Coordinates of C-alpha atoms and ligand atoms in Angstrom, one line a residue:
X205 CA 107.1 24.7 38.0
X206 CA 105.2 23.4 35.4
X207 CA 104.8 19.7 34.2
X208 CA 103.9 17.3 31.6
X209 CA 100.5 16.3 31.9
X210 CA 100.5 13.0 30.3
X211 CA 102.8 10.2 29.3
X212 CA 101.7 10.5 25.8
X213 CA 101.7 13.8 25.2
X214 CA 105.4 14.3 26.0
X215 CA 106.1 11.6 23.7
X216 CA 104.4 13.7 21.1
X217 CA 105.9 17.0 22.4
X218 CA 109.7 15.7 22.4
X219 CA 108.5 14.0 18.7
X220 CA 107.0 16.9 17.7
X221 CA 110.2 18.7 17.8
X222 CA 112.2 15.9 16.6
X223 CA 109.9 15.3 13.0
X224 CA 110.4 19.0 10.7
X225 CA 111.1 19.7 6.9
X226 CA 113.7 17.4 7.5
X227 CA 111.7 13.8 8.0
X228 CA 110.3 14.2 4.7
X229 CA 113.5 16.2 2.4
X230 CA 116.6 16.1 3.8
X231 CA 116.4 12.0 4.7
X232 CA 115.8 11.0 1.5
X233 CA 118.0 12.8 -0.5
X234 CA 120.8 12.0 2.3
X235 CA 120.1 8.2 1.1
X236 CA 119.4 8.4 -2.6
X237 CA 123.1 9.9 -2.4
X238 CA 125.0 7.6 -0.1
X239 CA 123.9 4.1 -1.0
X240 CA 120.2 4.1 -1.4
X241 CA 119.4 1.4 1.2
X242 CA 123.3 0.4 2.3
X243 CA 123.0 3.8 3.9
X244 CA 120.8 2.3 6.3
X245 CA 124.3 0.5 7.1
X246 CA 125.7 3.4 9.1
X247 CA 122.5 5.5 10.2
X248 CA 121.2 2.9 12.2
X249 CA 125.0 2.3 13.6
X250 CA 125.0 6.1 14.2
X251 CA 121.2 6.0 15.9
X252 CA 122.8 3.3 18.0
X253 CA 126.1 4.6 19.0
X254 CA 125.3 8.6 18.9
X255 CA 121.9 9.5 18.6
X256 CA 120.2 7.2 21.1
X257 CA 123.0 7.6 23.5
X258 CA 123.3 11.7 24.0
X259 CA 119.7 12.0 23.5
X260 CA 119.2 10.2 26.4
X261 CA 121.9 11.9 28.6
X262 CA 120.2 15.0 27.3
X263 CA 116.9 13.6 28.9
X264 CA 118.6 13.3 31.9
X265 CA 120.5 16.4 32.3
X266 CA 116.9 18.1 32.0
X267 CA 115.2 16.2 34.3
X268 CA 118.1 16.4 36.9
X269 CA 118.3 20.1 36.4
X270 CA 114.2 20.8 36.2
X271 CA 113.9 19.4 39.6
X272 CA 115.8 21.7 41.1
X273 CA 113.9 24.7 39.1
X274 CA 116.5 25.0 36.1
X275 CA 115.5 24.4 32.8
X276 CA 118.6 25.9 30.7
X277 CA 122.3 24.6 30.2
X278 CA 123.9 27.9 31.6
X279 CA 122.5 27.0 35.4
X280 CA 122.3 23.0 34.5
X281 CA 125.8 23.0 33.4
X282 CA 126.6 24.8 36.6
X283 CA 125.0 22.1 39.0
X284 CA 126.8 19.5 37.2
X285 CA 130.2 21.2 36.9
X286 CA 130.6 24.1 39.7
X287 CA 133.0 26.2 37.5
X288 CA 132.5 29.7 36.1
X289 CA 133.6 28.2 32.4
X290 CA 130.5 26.2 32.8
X291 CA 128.5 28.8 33.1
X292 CA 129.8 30.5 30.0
X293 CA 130.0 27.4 28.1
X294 CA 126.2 27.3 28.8
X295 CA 125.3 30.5 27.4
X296 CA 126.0 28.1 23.8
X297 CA 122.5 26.1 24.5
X298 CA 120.9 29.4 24.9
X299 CA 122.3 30.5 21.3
X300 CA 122.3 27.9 19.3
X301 CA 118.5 28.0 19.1
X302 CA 118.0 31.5 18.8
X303 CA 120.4 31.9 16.0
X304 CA 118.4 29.3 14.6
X305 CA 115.1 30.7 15.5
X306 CA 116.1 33.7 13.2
X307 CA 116.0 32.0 9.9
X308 CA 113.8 28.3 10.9
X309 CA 110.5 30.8 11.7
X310 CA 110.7 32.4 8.6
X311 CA 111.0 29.5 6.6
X312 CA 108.2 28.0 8.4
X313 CA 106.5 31.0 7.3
X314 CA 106.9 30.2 3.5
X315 CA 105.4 26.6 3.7
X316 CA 102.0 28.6 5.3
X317 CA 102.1 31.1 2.4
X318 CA 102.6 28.4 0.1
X319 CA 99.7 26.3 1.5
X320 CA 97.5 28.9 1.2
X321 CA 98.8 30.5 -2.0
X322 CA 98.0 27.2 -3.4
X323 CA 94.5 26.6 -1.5
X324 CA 93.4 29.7 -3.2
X325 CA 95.0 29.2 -6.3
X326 CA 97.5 31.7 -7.0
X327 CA 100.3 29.7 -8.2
X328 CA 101.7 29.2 -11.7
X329 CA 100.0 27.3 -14.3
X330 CA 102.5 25.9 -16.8
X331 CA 103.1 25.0 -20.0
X332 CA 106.3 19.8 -22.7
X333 CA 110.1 20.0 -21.2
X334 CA 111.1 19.8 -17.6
X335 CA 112.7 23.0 -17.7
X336 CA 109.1 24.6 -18.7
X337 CA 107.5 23.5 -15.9
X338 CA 110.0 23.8 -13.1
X339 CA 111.2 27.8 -13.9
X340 CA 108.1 29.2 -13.7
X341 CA 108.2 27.7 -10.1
X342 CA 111.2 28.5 -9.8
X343 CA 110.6 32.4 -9.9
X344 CA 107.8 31.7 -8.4
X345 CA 109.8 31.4 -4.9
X346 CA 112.5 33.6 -5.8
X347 CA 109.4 36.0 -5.9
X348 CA 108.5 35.1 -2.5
X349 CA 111.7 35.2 -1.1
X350 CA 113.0 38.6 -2.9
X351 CA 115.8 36.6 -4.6
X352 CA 118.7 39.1 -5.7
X353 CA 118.3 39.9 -9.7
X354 CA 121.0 42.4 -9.5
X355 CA 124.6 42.1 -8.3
X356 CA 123.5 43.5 -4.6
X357 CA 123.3 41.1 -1.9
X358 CA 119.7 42.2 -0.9
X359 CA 116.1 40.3 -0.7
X360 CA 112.7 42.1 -0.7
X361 CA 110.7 39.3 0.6
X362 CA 107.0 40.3 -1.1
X363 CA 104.2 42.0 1.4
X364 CA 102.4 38.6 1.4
X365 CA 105.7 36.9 2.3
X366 CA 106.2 39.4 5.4
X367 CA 102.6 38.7 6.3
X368 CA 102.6 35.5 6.5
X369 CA 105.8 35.8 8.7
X370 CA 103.7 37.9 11.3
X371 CA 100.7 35.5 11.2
X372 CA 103.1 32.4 11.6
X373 CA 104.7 34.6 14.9
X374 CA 101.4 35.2 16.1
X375 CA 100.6 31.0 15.9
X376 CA 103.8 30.3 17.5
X377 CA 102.9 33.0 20.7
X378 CA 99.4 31.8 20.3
X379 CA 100.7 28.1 21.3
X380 CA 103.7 29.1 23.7
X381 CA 101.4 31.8 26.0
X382 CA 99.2 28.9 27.0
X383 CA 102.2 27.3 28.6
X384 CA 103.7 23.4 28.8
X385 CA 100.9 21.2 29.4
X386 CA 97.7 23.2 28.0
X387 CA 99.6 24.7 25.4
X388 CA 103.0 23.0 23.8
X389 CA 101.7 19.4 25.1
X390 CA 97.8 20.3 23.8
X391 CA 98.8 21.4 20.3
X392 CA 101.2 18.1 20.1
X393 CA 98.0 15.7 21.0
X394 CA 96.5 17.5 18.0
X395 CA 99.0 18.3 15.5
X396 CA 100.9 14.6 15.5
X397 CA 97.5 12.9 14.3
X398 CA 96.6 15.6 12.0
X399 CA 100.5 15.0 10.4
X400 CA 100.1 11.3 10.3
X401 CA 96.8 11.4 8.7
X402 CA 98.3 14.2 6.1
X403 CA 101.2 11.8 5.5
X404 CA 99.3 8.4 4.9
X405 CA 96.6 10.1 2.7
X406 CA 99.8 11.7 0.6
X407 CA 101.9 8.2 0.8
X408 CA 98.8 6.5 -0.9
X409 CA 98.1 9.2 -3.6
X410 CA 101.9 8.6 -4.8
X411 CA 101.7 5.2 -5.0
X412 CA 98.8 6.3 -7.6
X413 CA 101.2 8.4 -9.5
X414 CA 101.8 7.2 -13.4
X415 CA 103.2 9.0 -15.8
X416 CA 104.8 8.5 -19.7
X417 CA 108.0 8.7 -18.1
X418 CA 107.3 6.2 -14.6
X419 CA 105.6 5.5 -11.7
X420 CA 105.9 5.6 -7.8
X421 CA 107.6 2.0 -7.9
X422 CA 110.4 3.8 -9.7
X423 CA 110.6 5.8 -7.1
X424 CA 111.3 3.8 -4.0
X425 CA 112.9 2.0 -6.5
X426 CA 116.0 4.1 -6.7
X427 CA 115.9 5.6 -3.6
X428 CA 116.0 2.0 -1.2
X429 CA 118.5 -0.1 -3.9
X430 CA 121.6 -0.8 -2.0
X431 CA 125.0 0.5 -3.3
X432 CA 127.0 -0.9 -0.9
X433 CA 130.2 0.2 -2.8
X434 CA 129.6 3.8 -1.0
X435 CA 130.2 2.2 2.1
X436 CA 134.2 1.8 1.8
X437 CA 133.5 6.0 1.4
X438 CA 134.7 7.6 5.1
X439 CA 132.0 10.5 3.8
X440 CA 129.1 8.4 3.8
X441 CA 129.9 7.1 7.2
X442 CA 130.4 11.4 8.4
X443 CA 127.2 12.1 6.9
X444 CA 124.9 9.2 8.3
X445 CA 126.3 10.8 12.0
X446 CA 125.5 14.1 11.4
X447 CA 122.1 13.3 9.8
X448 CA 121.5 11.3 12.9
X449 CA 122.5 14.3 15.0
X450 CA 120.3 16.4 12.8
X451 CA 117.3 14.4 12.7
X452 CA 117.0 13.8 16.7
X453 CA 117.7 17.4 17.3
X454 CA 120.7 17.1 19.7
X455 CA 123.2 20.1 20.5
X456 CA 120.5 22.7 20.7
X457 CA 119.7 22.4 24.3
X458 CA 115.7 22.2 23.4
X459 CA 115.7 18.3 24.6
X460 CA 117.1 19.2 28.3
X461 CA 114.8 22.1 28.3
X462 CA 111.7 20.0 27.5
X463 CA 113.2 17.1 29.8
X464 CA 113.0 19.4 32.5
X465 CA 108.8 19.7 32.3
X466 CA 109.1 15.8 32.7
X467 CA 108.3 15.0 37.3
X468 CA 111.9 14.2 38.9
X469 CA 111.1 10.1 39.4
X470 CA 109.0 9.9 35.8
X471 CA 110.7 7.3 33.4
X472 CA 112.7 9.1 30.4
X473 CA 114.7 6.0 29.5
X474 CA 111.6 4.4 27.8
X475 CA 110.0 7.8 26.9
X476 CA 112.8 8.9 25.2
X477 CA 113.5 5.7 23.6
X478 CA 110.1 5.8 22.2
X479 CA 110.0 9.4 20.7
X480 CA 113.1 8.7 19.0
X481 CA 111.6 5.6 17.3
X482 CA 108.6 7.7 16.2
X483 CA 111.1 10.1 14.4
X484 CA 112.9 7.3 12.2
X485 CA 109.5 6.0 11.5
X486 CA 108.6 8.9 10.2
X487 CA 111.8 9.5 8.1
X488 CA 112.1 5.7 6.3
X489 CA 108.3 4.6 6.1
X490 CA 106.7 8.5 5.6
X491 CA 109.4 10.8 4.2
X492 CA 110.6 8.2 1.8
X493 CA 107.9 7.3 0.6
X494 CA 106.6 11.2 -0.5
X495 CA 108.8 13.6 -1.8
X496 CA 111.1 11.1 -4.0
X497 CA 109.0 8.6 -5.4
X498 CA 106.6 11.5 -6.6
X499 CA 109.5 13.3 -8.4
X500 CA 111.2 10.2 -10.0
X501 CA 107.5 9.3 -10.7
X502 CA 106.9 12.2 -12.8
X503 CA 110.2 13.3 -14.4
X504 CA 111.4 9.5 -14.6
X505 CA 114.6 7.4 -13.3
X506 CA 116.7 9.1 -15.6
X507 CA 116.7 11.7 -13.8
X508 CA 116.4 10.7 -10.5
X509 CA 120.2 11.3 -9.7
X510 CA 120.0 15.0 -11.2
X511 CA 116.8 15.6 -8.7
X512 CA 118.8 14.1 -5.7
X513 CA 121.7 16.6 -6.5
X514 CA 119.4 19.0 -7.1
X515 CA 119.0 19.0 -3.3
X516 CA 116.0 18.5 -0.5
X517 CA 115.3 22.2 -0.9
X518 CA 114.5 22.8 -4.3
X519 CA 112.4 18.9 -4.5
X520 CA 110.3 20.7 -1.8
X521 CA 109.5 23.6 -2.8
X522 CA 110.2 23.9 -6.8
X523 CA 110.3 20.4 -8.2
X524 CA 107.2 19.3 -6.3
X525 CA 104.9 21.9 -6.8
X526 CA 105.5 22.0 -10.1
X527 CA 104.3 18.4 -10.2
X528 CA 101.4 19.2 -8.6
X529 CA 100.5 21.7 -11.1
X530 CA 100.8 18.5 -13.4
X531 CA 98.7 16.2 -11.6
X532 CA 95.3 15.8 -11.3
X533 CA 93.7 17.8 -8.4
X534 CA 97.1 19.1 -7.6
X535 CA 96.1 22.2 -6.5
X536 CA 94.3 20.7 -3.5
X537 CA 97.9 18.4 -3.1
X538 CA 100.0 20.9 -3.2
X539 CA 97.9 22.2 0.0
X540 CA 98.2 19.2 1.9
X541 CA 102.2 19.1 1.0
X542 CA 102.3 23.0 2.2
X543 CA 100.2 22.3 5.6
X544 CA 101.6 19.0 6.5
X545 CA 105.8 20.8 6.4
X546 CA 104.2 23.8 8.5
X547 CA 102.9 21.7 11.0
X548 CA 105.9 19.9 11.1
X549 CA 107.6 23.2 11.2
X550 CA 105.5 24.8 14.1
X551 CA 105.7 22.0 16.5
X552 CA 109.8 22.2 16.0
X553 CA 109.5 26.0 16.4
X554 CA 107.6 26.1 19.5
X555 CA 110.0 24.0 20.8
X556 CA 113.2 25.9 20.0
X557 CA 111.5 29.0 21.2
X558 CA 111.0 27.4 24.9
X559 CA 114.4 27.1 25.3
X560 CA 114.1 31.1 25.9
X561 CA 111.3 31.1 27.6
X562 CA 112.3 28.8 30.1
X563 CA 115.4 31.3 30.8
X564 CA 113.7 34.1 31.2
X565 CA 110.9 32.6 33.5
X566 CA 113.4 30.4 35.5
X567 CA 116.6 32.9 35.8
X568 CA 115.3 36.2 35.8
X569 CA 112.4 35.2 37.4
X570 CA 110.1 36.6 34.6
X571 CA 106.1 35.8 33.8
X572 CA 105.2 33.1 31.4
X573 CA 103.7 35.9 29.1
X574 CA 106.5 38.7 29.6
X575 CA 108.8 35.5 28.8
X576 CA 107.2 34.5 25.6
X577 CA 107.0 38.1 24.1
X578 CA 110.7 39.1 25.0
X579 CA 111.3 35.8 23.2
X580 CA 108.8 36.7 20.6
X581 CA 110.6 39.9 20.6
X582 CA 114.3 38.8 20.2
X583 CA 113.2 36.0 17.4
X584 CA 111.3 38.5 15.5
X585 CA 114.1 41.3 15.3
X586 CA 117.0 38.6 14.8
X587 CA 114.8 37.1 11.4
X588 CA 115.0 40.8 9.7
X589 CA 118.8 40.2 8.7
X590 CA 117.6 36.6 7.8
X591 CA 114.9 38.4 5.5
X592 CA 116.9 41.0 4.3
X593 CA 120.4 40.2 3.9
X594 CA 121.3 37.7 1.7
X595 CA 123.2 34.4 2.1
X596 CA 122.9 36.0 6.3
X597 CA 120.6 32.6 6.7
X598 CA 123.6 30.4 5.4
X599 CA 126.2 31.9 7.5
X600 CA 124.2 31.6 10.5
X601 CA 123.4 27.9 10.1
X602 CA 126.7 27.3 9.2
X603 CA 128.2 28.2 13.1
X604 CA 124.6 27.0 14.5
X605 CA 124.7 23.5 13.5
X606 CA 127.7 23.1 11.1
X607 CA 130.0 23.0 14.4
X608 CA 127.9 24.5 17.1
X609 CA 125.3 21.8 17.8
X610 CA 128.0 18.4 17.9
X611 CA 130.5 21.1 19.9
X612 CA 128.0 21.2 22.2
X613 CA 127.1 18.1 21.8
X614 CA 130.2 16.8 22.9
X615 CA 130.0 19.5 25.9
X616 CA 127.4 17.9 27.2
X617 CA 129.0 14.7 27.4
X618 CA 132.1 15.5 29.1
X619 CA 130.5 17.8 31.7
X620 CA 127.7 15.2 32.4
X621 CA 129.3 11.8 31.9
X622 CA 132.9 12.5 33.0
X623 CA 133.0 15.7 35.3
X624 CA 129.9 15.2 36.8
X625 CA 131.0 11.5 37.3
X626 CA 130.0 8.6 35.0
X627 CA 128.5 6.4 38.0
X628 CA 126.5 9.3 38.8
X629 CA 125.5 10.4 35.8
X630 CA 124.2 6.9 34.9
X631 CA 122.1 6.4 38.0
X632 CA 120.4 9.7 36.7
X633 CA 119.4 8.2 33.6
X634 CA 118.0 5.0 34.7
X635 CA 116.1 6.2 37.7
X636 CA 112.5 5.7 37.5
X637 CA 113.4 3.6 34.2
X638 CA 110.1 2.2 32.9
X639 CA 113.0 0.0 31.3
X640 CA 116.0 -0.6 32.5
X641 CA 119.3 0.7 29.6
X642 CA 121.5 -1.8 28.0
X643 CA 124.6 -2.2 30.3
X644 CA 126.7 -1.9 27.4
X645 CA 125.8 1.7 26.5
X646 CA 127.8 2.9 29.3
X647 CA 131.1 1.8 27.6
X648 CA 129.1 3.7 24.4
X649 CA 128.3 7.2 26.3
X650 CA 131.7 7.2 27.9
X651 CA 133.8 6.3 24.9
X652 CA 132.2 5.7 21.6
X653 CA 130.0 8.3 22.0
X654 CA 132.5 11.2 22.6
X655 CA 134.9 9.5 20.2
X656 CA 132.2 9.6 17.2
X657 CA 132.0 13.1 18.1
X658 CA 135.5 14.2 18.2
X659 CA 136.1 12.9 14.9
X660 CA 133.5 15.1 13.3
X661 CA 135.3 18.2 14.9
X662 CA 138.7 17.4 13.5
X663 CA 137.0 16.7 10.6
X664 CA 135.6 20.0 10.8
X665 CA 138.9 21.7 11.5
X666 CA 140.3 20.3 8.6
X667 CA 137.7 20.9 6.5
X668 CA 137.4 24.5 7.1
X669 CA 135.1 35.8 2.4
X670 CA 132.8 38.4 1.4
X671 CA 132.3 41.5 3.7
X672 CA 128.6 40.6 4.2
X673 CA 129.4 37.5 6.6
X674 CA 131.1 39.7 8.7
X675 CA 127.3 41.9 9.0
X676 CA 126.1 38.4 10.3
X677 CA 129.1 37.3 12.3
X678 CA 128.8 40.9 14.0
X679 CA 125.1 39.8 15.1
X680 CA 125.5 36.6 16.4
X681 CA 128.5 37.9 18.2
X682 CA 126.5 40.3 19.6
X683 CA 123.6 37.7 20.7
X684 CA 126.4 35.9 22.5
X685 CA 127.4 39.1 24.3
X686 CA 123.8 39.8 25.0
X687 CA 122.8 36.3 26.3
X688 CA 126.6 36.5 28.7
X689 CA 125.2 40.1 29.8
X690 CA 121.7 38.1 31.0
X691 CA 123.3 35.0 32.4
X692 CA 125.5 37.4 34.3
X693 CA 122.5 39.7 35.0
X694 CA 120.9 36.5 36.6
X695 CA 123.5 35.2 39.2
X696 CA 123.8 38.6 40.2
X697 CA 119.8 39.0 41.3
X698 CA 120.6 35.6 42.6
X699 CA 123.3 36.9 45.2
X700 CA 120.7 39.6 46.5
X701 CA 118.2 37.1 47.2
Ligands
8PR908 F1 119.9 23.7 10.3 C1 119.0 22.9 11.0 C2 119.6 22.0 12.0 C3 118.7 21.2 12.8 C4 117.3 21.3 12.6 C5 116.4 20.3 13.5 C6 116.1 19.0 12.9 C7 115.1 18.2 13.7 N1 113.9 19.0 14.1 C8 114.3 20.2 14.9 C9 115.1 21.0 14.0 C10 115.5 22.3 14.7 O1 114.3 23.0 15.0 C11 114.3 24.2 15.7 C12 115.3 24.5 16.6 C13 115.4 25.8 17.3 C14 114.4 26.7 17.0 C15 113.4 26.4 16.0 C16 113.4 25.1 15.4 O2 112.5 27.5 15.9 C17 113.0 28.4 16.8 O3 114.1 28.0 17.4 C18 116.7 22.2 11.7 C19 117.6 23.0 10.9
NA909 NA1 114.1 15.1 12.0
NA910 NA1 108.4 20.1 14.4

């Protein structure tokens, strides 16, 4: 089985995966609107109580289950919890990131196009008035994508947008063929520097930005200003866990998976610990200090509420390249912008695609390269209804992370920390612990945890159609059924041997 070659890089790896789009869109926005800096309030009592905690039971769980040659929930949830429902119930940490792999590899694939559309030049050129400057952007992605003009739910992505998708599935296979170590663990040691260096070098060009209408003090300005008066708001307090949940990448299964690379007595407690720091680093000092300072920079504080409710997707890729088409030597920005979320995308990608791999190579006892390509194979077919099918990218996200990721996140709990047995389960984490964890956080993984959990299914519940859903409900059914027929396949060729 293969291994993590060094300490660092499976720091970088397990960051890698953790740092996307998200560091640098969805954080901020997520503050400007609950609080500004009082929001810090409950994200770092979510990193504390959630995050931190199941990320490093999911550490463990991989470890424990990659020393015994298991690097997926179905057979790691087995070994924990001998039952046939856990078997099933692990089939979820095998689907969650391929339902997701449908629609985050495309998207990945428009930051690449983007970056080199605007290396090369070929983006609009406005003129005045906000609206003149961001519509011609505006089409300029609905373009790309293949945005419906008529009342037909269909997209027809452009040839270059299809393209692009292929190249950015080649680079993914291109990394995951070489394997763990010389592959997903080389490309980390290269691609975490190269972001960092892309960030800093964009973090100081903001803090250049002055317009007429402000400047990049404005920015960070509005966005870190406490309103603690959204704290009393029970909403605030839901969304600072799930961003949390969303910004460590829990539920998905990818951190056991990777965890189970990491040698049977190697620390994770202080590995893990260290990764995740690098991640909120990345979200308060580098994300925060990019995309929103830039925009409230050029379009001024006035506005800066409208550009927060505007959402982290269009600041990223409509608002901001159309200030780069207003700024001096924008062209060559708008590059760096484009690379630096690609890179951030492909090292998340690579990750989520492992999860397969590892299945296939560990459970049906396939080759590293027959793995990947199947993989390749499934992710690729999946993305056309993604491409194709319109709002079938929100409808899958919505079952992927909007319940599946903190249902299974919860899953994991209960089968590690209370049917597997707490006492156990904690020996598990702390063994070979560079660092030794906080005594308290077992009271934390055992209730709060769970508890903090719970809430945001009944919340959920509570909280919660066209004929087309149905198109992408039938698919990821289906994957469901498929991925069953394959776990089944597996402890079948099991019995023989
Ligand atoms: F809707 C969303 C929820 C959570 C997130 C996570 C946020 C932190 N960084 C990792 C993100 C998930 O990344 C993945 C996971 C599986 C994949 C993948 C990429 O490509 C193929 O299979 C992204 C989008
Ligand atoms: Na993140
Ligand atoms: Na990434």
């Amino acid at each position: 089985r293969e291994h993590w070659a060094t300490r660092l890089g499976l720091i970088l790896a397990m960051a890698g995966y953790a740092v996307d789009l998200g560091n640098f869109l969805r954080f901020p926005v997520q503050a400007a609107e609950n609080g500004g800096g009082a929001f810090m309030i409950p994200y770092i009592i979510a990193f504390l109580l959630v995050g931190i905690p199941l990320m490093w039971i999911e550490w463990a769980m991989g470890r424990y289950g990659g020393a015994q040659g298991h690097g997926t929930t179905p057979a790691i949830f087995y070994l924990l919890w001998r039952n046939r429902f856990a078997k099933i119930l692990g089939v979820f940490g095998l689907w969650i990131p391929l339902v997701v792999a449908s629609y985050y590899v495309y998207i990945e694939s428009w930051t690449l196009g983007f970056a080199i559309k605007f290396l090369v030049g070929l983006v609009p050129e406005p003129p005045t008035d906000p609206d003149s400057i961001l519509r011609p952007f505006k089409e300029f992605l609905y373009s790309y994508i293949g945005v419906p003009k008529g009342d037909e739910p269909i997209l027809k992505p452009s040839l270059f947008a299809y393209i692009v998708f292929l190249i950015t599935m080649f680079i993914n296979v291109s990394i995951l063929i070489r394997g763990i170590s010389k592959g997903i663990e080389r490309f980390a040691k290269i691609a975490m520097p190269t972001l960092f260096i892309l960030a800093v070098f964009l973090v100081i060009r903001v803090f250049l930005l002055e317009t007429p209408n402000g400047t990049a003090a404005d920015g960070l300005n509005f966005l870190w200003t406490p309103d603690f008066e959204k704290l009393k708001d029970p909403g605030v307090w839901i969304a600072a866990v799930g961003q949390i949940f969303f910004s460590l990448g829990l539920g998905f299964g990818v951190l056991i998976t990777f965890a189970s690379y990491v040698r049977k007595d190697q620390d994770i407690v202080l590995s893990g610990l260290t990764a995740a720091t690098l991640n909120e680093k990345a979200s308060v000092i580098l994300g925060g200090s990019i995309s929103i300072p830039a925009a409230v920079a050029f379009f001024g504080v006035a506005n800066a509420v409208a550009i927060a409710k505007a959402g982290a997707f269009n600041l990223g890729f409509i608002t901001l390249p159309a200030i780069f088409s207003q700024t001096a030597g924008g062209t060559f920005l708008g590059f760096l912008w484009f690379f630096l979320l690609f890179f951030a995308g492909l090292t998340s990608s690579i990750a989520g695609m492992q999860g397969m791999i590892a299945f296939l190579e560990d459970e049906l006892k396939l080759s590293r390269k027959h793995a990947v390509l199947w993989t390749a194979a499934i992710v690729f077919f999946s993305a056309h209804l993604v491409m194709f099918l319109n709002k079938s990218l929100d409808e899958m996200d919505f079952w992927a992370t909007g319940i599946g990721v903190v249902f299974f996140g919860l899953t994991e709990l209960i089968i590690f920390f209370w049917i597997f047995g707490a006492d156990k389960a904690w020996e598990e984490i702390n063994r070979g612990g560079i660092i030794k964890v906080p005594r308290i956080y077992y009271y934390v993984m055992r209730y709060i945890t769970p508890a903090f959990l719970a809430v945001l299914l009944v919340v959920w519940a509570r909280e919660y159609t066209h004929w087309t859903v149905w198109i992408t409900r039938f698919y990821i059914i289906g994957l469901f059924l498929f991925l069953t027929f394959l776990v089944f396949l597996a402890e079948r060729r099991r019995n023989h041997e």
